[PDB]
Design a protein around this ligand. Sequence first.
Ligand SMILES: CC(=O)c1c(C)[nH]c(C(=O)N2CCC[C@@H](c3n[nH]cc3CN3CCCC3)C2)c1C
Ligand SMILES: [Mg+2]
Length: 103
Amino acid sequence: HSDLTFCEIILMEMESHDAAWPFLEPVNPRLVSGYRRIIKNPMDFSTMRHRLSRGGYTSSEEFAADALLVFDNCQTFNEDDSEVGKAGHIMRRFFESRWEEFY
Ligand SMILES: CC(=O)c1c(C)[nH]c(C(=O)N2CCC[C@@H](c3n[nH]cc3CN3CCCC3)C2)c1C
Ligand SMILES: [Mg+2]
């Protein structure tokens, strides 16, 4: 698959990005007050890595949906001027531009 090929490329670059530190592992709701109540479908890069490794993505569209979920959730829970929120805007702009320079 040429679609799955670029997903592996763009996931690799996001995992290694400087501003990827809030998204490398799932949020622990025990450690974050209100997260469980506010974020219905959590998502992060390791969950995407796991689903790609086991062949769980059909098309590149499903991969893009999970990536946009990460940043949608980030903007739903975190203030735009929080540390986590600022890293998410950097990561979201990176993904949007990189995804469009291929498709
Ligand atoms: C609540 C929220 O939307 C959020 C997201 C999407 N991500 C983070 C976040 O901060 N992390 C992600 C999980 C691991 C955390 C981690 N990994 N190694 C050490 C730490 C400790 N953190 C806390 C402060 C210093 C780093 C970092 C939040 C709050
Ligand atoms: Mg959107």
